[PDB]
Predict the structure of Glycoside hydrolase, family 43.
Amino acid sequence: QPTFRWAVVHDPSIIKVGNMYYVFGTHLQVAKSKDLMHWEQINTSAHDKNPIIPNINEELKETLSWARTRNDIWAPQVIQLSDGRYYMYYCASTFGSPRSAIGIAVSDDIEGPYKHYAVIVKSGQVYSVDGPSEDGTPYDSRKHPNALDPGVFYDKEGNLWMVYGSWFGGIYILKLDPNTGLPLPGQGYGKRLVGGNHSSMEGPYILYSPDTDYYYLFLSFGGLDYRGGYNIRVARSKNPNGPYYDPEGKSMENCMGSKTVISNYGAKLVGNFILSESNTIDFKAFGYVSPGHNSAYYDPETGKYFIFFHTRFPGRGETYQLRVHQLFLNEDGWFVMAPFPYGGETVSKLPNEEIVGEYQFINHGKEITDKIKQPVRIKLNSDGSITGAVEGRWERKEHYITLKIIEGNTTVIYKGVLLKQWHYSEKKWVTVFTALSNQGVSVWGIRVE
Ligand SMILES: [Ca+2]
């Protein structure tokens, strides 16, 4: 019964306005929805006649001039501040460069037109012409962030923050004045949360959970392209400005260096996969390549959580869509992602008869890889045993599942949730599980019915 119509929105940032969900993305790709499943595209590029920011080159002359670019802005996020106006935080840049700026535009109406408000953070200063970086020292792209990818959020106390960054100096957070949206004076680039020295991370987003009273920091590791191994990582903190820690207890301030090294940190939520045993490219089969650059939302009306992200697809190169999935909290207060896109599903306790059976099983691992992971077959048996491709034991308590799986010479415990979801490709309701270990590895199970 559920149906879908996606949008084409790269780097999507969610905002709810009235009964309508909007996503704002790179190139001023904008779309909206009442149900999270059918999306109406309202803008597709930052051309001179777009209605979101008309005549953008003149309107945002300050940031675009800085970035030496035209007809484009990257990773915009709109947030409603206390005056009721809509503030679009965005960045201007060029591919591969740290010559970037974070700006703010403002509108009275969600769909615009937005006008210039402020220029707030700059990177890529060339000392002989521009002078120092924001911290008063010469810009050094190993230490200083790239002024990209703003993630703005209120904390539980009403303070306003912006987490930001992409590669280069890492991921930083600035405290903002709730009344103006501007960074409070005297912070330079702010506090470093993750990364440094050109570590492959970007798109930071922070979400508060009332259900656990933690803040969750979402990052994308790797490259966004087909061969980049883009993957979504999660850490959490009792404080909006950290330190953030992963499920193993590692501090994300220590996450920096090579791809192999940074891969050791964070809960990896999803990487590349396809639900085909046949082949790694199978256009009938559900699968993603380079899912990332996400935002997230908590809906107080229902208590559900959602992740908004773009992704590419097996065998389809750089083509991408918006996708929306539900997130759940496991018994340890960590997020686990629903295998399939959101079709209206609400978790509840399943009886045993709906749990027992053969599953396709995907282990997403811990690495940053472009490998398209495929499933193996396992069975969850009535006696609590796991058999097939892996051995172990499973148990459940309400909708919380625990899987204890033998991996080499050790048992790894995965904790997650069980529910019924809409099988996106098979078009039927099926049992699924999604679970996470303390080493930050996600597993998905999709019941063969
Ligand atoms: Ca973002």
In short: Residues 76 and 90 are 4 Å apart (CA to CA). Residues 61-67 form the longest helix (7 residues).
